[PDB]
Amino acid sequence: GRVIRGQRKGRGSIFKSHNHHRKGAAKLRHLDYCEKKGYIKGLVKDIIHDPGRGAPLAKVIFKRTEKYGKKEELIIASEGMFTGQYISCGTKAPLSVGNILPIGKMPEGTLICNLEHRTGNRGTLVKASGCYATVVGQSEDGKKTKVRLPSGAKKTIDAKARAMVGVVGAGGRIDKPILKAGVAHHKYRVKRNCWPKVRGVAMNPVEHPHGGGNHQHIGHPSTVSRSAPAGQKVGLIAARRTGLLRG
Template identity: 30%
Template sequence: MKDISQMKEREDLGSYTVWEEVLIDRKEESTSTNMPLGTPIHNIEMILRKGGQLANPAGAVVKVIAKEGKSATLKLCSREVYLLSKNCLATIKQVGNVGVNQNSLGRAKSKYWLDKRPVVRGVVMNIVDHPYGGGEKRAPIGRKKPAIPWGYPALGRRSRKRNKYSDDLILRRRSK
């Protein structure tokens, strides 16, 4: 491996990307053109220069499983397989704070200090406040089908757009 200062001294620096000379174990941005297969990446662009959209949350990681022509195949942690352009930017390594959901705050007040307000169940509300509300004592949901507070159906209704632009990029959907 050569040092970056040595690389700057070379006259033909513009003929290749920096990733040919730098180790990939540092957390940097790169295109998937020069990444070896199996590289863990996150914060991936789906469309060129649009910004990172895939694998943003804590602990998320995506693996480069194949490169062919102008596209690269990526395997997400949800076991979905995406086909993206090699020129889309990504950040190497896994997102930190992996065990964010493993720690226990201990009591309700600790959560309140983090500005996480208590959530009231819809069943205990009045009928004017929530579709599940109303009824005497411990009545179940008052409607035939569950709904969100704004009246639209909930629990099982598909919310993804039918003709979303990323449908063409998904090679294999996640199993339910």
């Protein structure tokens, strides 16, 4: 028939992300010898808003270890971070909020954010506003550490991999309801080309397979296998249970 909207989205085109307002990639400090063996203290010089990210960025100054003068990083701002706050990063760094530490050096039940799945990958996990991970265990012979993702899922990473003490800024953001369609427009204007998000069942069956039927019938199961073709994967892929969640 005619290609479905989700399949059309991957052709790239006008569906590339709206990066104009966005201030640079939010990746943490890279691992180095100074971080590995000791620690570095830096100063948070400014806090700035990014709208692609759910929370602010923090402009942090370190002094060039291999050379001379001042170097600026962009860290994700923890809640309770402030301008003129001192941030410490490294193996021998003290335990305190917003510090950047290997997960092995956290005491259990601590709350942390900006986890990395491998050492020096620069905070690839736990980046959204108000969010946090919990350390849920430390290996008896070391090397591994067990942490709990903000989904509630438990995962085991190497102890060497870094994370950032405390919770991400701008928490409770989802608690306010969306007031109006213009507010929704302003949100999508800085995000992605993705909206208005029209129903599939309304359309021609030709142009979305939930479509057709004189009185807008679905006419076929809405639960789809993950083994299905991409153009067939319009419905609920690999749906273990459907209906209202209960218990």
